[PDB]
Structure formats: structure tokens, C-alpha cells
């Protein structure tokens, strides 16, 4: 008659099955943090992703700043003597590499903070993701005790007292 | 070159961050599912249900009334009491 | 080997530079109190 | 044992890294003490069922 | 021995050594103590059973 109805009358064997679930959280309650676990993992791997790749800067700045150091002892060599026109140009090529440096460099600082506050995100995450799924086999627990507490009373009323005494005491007035 | 490789080099970073933005929203926004308040409500509200359910106990058999429980007591003041004071008049 | 060896260092988080502090300053009081104590054996 | 011989800078530190885990010894040793009323009524609630 | 005649240099390394080993030791020597309980009352477990 309606969508909200014939995406009714389509999954009517399921709309009852979804709010079943949804009204009992066995499935999803368990499967979210399984799921959950899945980010994790994926959080875990595309983490690693920033600390390889920041580092392989640092490498790069090493060979270059080793490189400097050729072109700064290169200059240092082809200074001696007095022979300081040769060292001239060689200190000019070092300035090219020392822009490469300082820029490289200080990109990693602000990245430690990105790599550090993310790992302490992560930290906290991993307690809290724990410590939610510490107390959900307690509420479950009660859950079950809260169906084993209700279940065995709900039952308990069929022959309690009153009409339901009268199933026997009333047969007893026969 | 230089600028080609250096696009090149950066990209990763905000694509690990662009993942990491990916993975630092999927962490939040799945975990929002049972934090608090209706979220909690799918298994609070069902601790709501054991108490509408367990007034239908305590409806079906009413809770031992303060008077009677003040009874109990009471006769166990004076259980204990005239049991030990009868207990400790057999040593004596 | 980075970005796998970052899976190791995530999964055994690396000794940091306190317990490394804590390690060799440990090992600093162990060698000055044994090789303390060992001496003082022959005094 | 950091702390001896007036090493308390390296000691101080120390200390700090200890209140992270007291604070989750107390909230996780009280969650105890209400769940042995659950346990301990339940178990009565059995008993007398 | 090395530690001789006054020649703790060549010492110092091998007690170095040994700490190695004291670490070795006083870990899996506590393990046992705990072992022993668990020996001990499935043992008295058993003889109850």
C-alpha cells in the first residue's frame, strides 16, 4: 500500500527479524566490535602507513645532508691552501641541499605530533574499545539473568494462587 | 622532477591521513551505535523491561511489607534473644 | 620492511627512552653495586 | 628504588606513570564490590526460588 | 679469578656478563613457587577426589 509497507510486505519475514534483533542486541552487540575490530586492524595497518613513509623523508635528508657534508668537506678540502675561488662554487651547490634539509626536516617535527597524538588516540581507544566490550558479557549477563529472572517468575504465575490454584483447588471443589 | 617526485611524496601522507581521516571516523561514527542515551537505551531500556517485568513479580506476589519485615526482624530480636537467653540458661 | 617492521613496533611498543633510561641506569646501580659489593669481598 | 640517593628527578616520573594505572585499580575494584550484591542476591534469589 | 692482582678492568665485563644471567634466573625461578600451588592443590584436588 506503501514503500514503508511494501519494503514491508517485501521483507515482512524480515522486518520482524530486524526488529527482533534490534530489540534483542545478541548479534549486532557482538559483530560491532568484530566489525569494529576490522578498523582497528585497518586503523592499525593504515597507521603504519604515516611511520614508514615519515622516516624514509629522514633518510633521504641524511643522504643529501651526507652530501652537504661531501660538498661542505669537498669545500673544506678545496679551500686549502688559499685556493678559495674553487670553494666558492662548492659552498653555492651545499646551499641548494641545505633548502632540501631545512624544509624536510621540520616536517617530520609536526608529524611526530600527528604519529604521537594519533598512537595516544589509538591508546585511549583501545581501553575504551575493552573496557565497552568488559562490561557488555556483564549486561548480557544480566540480560540473561533479566530472562532468567523474569522467565522463571513470568512461569511461575501459571499455578501461583487464585485462578491459578483454582486449576486444582477448584477441582478440588469438584 | 624535483616538484614531480615531491607531489609524489606527500600524496601518501594524506592518503595515510585521508585513511587515517577514513579510520578516525569509522572508529567514531560506528562507535556511536551504544554509547549513551538512546544508543544505551537498546540495553538500559531493556534493564527498564526487568523492572516492568519484575513489577509483575512483586505486583503477583507483593513485597514483604516493612511491618512484616519489621515482623521478621523483630521475631528473629526476639528469636535470637529468647533462644540465647534459654541457650546460656542451660550452662547456668 | 618499515611498514611492516611499524607493525612490529606498533604490535611490541619499542622500549622507550625512560626504561631504556630505567635499563642502563639499572645496569649502572647493577655494575656499581655488584662491582661495589665484589671488591668489597677482597677488603 | 629510583628515588634512592637523592635521585628524585628520575623517580618523579615514575610516580607520574603510576597514577595512570591507579586510577583504573579503584574505578574497576568498586565495579567488584556492587556486582557481590548481584552475585550475592541472585545467589539468594536462587536460593530461594 | 679475573678480578685478581687488582685487574677489575678485565672483571667488569665478565660480572657484566653475569647479569645477563640474573635476570635468567630470579624470573624463572619465581615460577616455580607459584607451579608449586598449582602441583600442590591439584594434588590435594586429586587426593580429594
Given at each position: 500500500?506503501?514503500?514503508?509497507?511494501?519494503?514491508?510486505?517485501?521483507?515482512?519475514?524480515?522486518?520482524?527479524?530486524?526488529?527482533?534483533?534490534?530489540?534483542?542486541?545478541?548479534?549486532?552487540?557482538?559483530?560491532?566490535?568484530?566489525?569494529m575490530?576490522?578498523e582497528l586492524?585497518e586503523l592499525r595497518?593504515a597507521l603504519?602507513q604515516t611511520?614508514?613513509?615519515?622516516?624514509?623523508?629522514?633518510?633521504?635528508?641524511?643522504?643529501?645532508?651526507?652530501?652537504?657534508?661531501?660538498?661542505?668537506?669537498?669545500?673544506?678540502?678545496?679551500?686549502?691552501?688559499?685556493?678559495?675561488?674553487?670553494?666558492?662554487?662548492?659552498?653555492?651547490?651545499?646551499?641548494?641541499?641545505?633548502?632540501?634539509?631545512?624544509?624536510?626536516?621540520?616536517?617530520?617535527?609536526?608529524?611526530?605530533?600527528l604519529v604521537?597524538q594519533v598512537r595516544g588516540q589509538l591508546?585511549k581507544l583501545?581501553?575504551?574499545?575493552?573496557?565497552?566490550?568488559?562490561?557488555?558479557?556483564?549486561?548480557?549477563?544480566?540480560?540473561?539473568?533479566?530472562?532468567?529472572?523474569?522467565?522463571?517468575?513470568?512461569?511461575?504465575?501459571?499455578?501461583?494462587?487464585?485462578?491459578?490454584?483454582?486449576?486444582?483447588?477448584?477441582?478440588?471443589?469438584? | 622532477?624535483?616538484?614531480?617526485?615531491?607531489?609524489?611524496?606527500?600524496?601518501?601522507?594524506y592518503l595515510a591521513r585521508l585513511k587515517s581521516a577514513i579510520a578516525a571516523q569509522k572508529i567514531e561514527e560506528i562507535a556511536g551505535?551504544?554509547?549513551?542515551?538512546?544508543?544505551?537505551?537498546?540495553?538500559?531500556?531493556?534493564?527498564?523491561?526487568?523492572?516492568?517485568?519484575?513489577?509483575?513479580?512483586?505486583?503477583?506476589?507483593?513485597?514483604?511489607?516493612?511491618?512484616?519485615?519489621?515482623?521478621?526482624?523483630?521475631?528473629?530480636?526476639?528469636?535470637?534473644?529468647?533462644?540465647?537467653?534459654?541457650?546460656?540458661?542451660?550452662?547456668?
Amino acid at each position: 500500500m506503501e514503500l514503508f509497507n511494501r519494503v514491508g510486505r517485501v521483507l515482512k519475514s524480515q522486518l520482524t527479524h530486524w526488529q527482533q534483533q534490534q530489540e534483542a542486541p545478541e548479534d549486532l552487540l557482538e559483530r560491532l566490535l568484530g566489525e569494529m575490530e576490522l578498523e582497528l586492524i585497518e586503523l592499525r595497518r593504515a597507521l603504519a602507513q604515516t611511520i614508514a613513509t615519515f622516516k624514509s623523508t629522514e633518510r633521504q635528508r641524511d643522504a643529501q645532508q651526507l652530501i652537504a657534508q661531501r660538498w661542505y668537506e669537498k669545500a673544506q678540502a678545496a679551500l686549502d691552501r688559499g685556493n678559495e675561488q674553487l670553494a666558492r662554487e662548492a659552498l653555492g651547490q651545499r646551499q641548494s641541499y641545505q633548502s632540501h634539509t631545512e624544509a624536510l626536516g621540520k616536517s617530520l617535527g609536526e608529524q611526530r605530533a600527528l604519529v604521537e597524538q594519533v598512537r595516544g588516540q589509538l591508546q585511549k581507544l583501545e581501553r575504551k574499545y575493552l573496557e565497552l566490550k568488559s562490561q557488555k558479557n556483564l549486561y548480557l549477563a544480566r540480560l540473561k539473568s533479566a530472562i532468567a529472572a523474569q522467565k522463571i517468575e513470568e512461569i511461575a504465575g501459571n499455578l501461583d494462587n487464585a485462578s491459578a490454584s483454582s486449576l486444582f483447588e477448584r477441582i478440588e471443589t469438584k | 622532477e624535483r616538484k614531480y617526485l615531491e607531489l609524489k611524496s606527500q600524496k601518501n601522507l594524506y592518503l595515510a591521513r585521508l585513511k587515517s581521516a577514513i579510520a578516525a571516523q569509522k572508529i567514531e561514527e560506528i562507535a556511536g551505535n551504544l554509547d549513551n542515551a538512546s544508543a544505551s537505551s537498546l540495553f538500559e531500556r531493556i534493564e527498564t523491561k526487568i523492572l516492568e517485568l519484575e513489577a509483575e513479580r512483586e505486583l503477583l506476589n507483593p513485597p514483604p511489607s516493612p511491618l512484616d519485615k519489621k515482623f521478621e526482624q523483630w521475631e528473629e530480636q526476639q528469636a535470637v534473644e529468647a533462644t540465647l537467653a534459654a541457650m546460656k540458661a542451660r550452662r547456668s
